[PDB]
Design a protein around this ligand. Structure first.
Ligand SMILES: Cc1cc(F)cc(C)c1Oc1ccc(C(C)(C)O)cc1-c1cn(C)c(=O)cc1NCC(=O)N[C@H]1CC[C@H](O)CC1
Ligand SMILES: Cc1cc(F)cc(C)c1Oc1ccc(C(C)(C)O)cc1-c1cn(C)c(=O)cc1NCC(=O)N[C@H]1CC[C@H](O)CC1
Ligand SMILES: Cc1cc(F)cc(C)c1Oc1ccc(C(C)(C)O)cc1-c1cn(C)c(=O)cc1NCC(=O)N[C@H]1CC[C@H](O)CC1
Ligand SMILES: Cc1cc(F)cc(C)c1Oc1ccc(C(C)(C)O)cc1-c1cn(C)c(=O)cc1NCC(=O)N[C@H]1CC[C@H](O)CC1
Lengths: 110, 110, 109, 110
């Protein structure tokens, strides 16, 4: 079943947004505020931004056919991070920790 | 007299808020989202929260008697950072660099 | 897309390189289920994947675009993440190798 | 209670004076020596000088009714520096490095 998978994706997303992982999840909770930061190049480099509050909306909206679609957007999020920042920056540190939460639980789907 | 000083303070606040210093000013731009971060003790420890936004509004209402009441609040902000956080934490290092901008320009007061 | 694939082929070369061997070697060849007495590997892991199956496919010009390359690599980390418990060393060794992958994939033009 | 706070402020001042920080505290252990420096204007510009010994001496004499009066002099000290000197000068870097030691430990105070 497809939503049988999708409510397991939805459970992952609860976990990502949950407190336990907030120390490193917080910069993905909402989309990078390129305006407040002075990021004149952000939207030239990230053609398709993506963050967990977008993923939560698309989940509540029911825009997701399969769990591959879910996973595709979450990886997009992390890769935008890895693309925009240097490897030594603190966001990359965080984004890794979170992704490793995601990749693990995602791999335990039936 | 004490309003040519407040004019000078406004020029400071505008430099703090300026995009030049955004790299380390951003965490002070609005309140510290305790609920999102998971900070259940932030309001235990920090009894009088303060952000450059709070400062800007108090200036915009002309609710500052003199330059010292200005400085009280901008220091209260930095203190709260320094109280809530460890010394090794990135915010503190951001808070210090911002304070250095403030403290220097507050010292060139007429 | 071969311009993109030149870049993937470099990432693959980087993964197999000596720099990362510390944590790369459990993914170098197929997991040896005979060896380990893991009678339940192939029950749980339907589509196995190693870096040198990936190299074999790279050399055969099998990859259409970078998605196909990245799919087979992520599949590799995922089998590991699925088969194993989180506390296990390979789960950390895979996570270290993947970060190296995901970063460098993300820089791709 | 006041002499608990002033006990703590006392410990700050002992920390300021300590060997750890002496690389950047040395321009502040004693009064700025206008005479040694050939500075016929230092006292025109800085009406109310201050330094750590003057603070140590007041701490010794119990001239401080509370923690604010402590901090206000320790800040008048860093301010006198930021007011007299250019920002490119070593003293300003020193005053800052030492101030950030002070400001931190001051906020930890109950
Ligand atoms: C910038 C930064 C500094 C830090 F110390 C810790 C984090 C997490 C940081 O990253 C962010 C902090 C806040 C925010 C807000 C709340 C505004 O959306 C976003 C990020 C951030 C998040 N994500 C996912 C990213 O991919 C990139 C982010 N930020 C990039 C960024 O701001 N770079 C600047 C570039 C200019 C330099 O002088 C300083 C660094
Ligand atoms: C946490 C953090 C990491 C980092 F690399 C850079 C900053 C600025 C950080 O601090 C903040 C990031 C975002 C925000 C938002 C946007 C939610 O208002 C606030 C802070 C923050 C800002 N200020 C001024 C503070 O004094 C404290 C702040 N944040 C503290 C904080 O998040 N603590 C937790 C404590 C639990 C730990 O497991 C992880 C850290
Ligand atoms: C078992 C083990 C211990 C260790 F310290 C490091 C690794 C990589 C280990 O795992 C492997 C060791 C060798 C090999 C060889 C080279 C023979 O293909 C493979 C693995 C291995 C690799 N990958 C990618 C995996 O996902 C899982 C692997 N090994 C699973 C494994 O052996 N599990 C057992 C399960 C039974 C338990 O009692 C103890 C752990
Ligand atoms: C001049 C200088 C050079 C240096 F590498 C480091 C310091 C601290 C320097 O400043 C001082 C050196 C000695 C002393 C003594 C110990 C005599 O009180 C004080 C200072 C000094 C300290 N503090 C807190 C100040 O605010 C200012 C100080 N001195 C300013 C000063 O000397 N400026 C002149 C201005 C004229 C210029 O042509 C050359 C430099």
């Amino acid at each position: 079943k497809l939503s049988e998978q999708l409510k397991h994706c939805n459970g992952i997303l609860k976990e990502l947004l949950s407190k336990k992982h907030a120390a490193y999840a917080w910069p993905f909770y909402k989309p990078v505020d390129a305006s407040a930061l002075g990021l004149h190049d952000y939207h030239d480099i990230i053609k398709h931004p993506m963050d967990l509050s977008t993923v939560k909306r698309k989940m509540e909206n029911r825009d997701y056919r399969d769990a591959q679609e879910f996973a595709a957007d979450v990886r997009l999020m992390f890769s935008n991070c890895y693309k925009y920042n240097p490897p030594d920056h603190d966001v990359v540190a965080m984004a890794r920790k979170l992704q490793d939460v995601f990749e693990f639980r995602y791999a335990k789907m039936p």
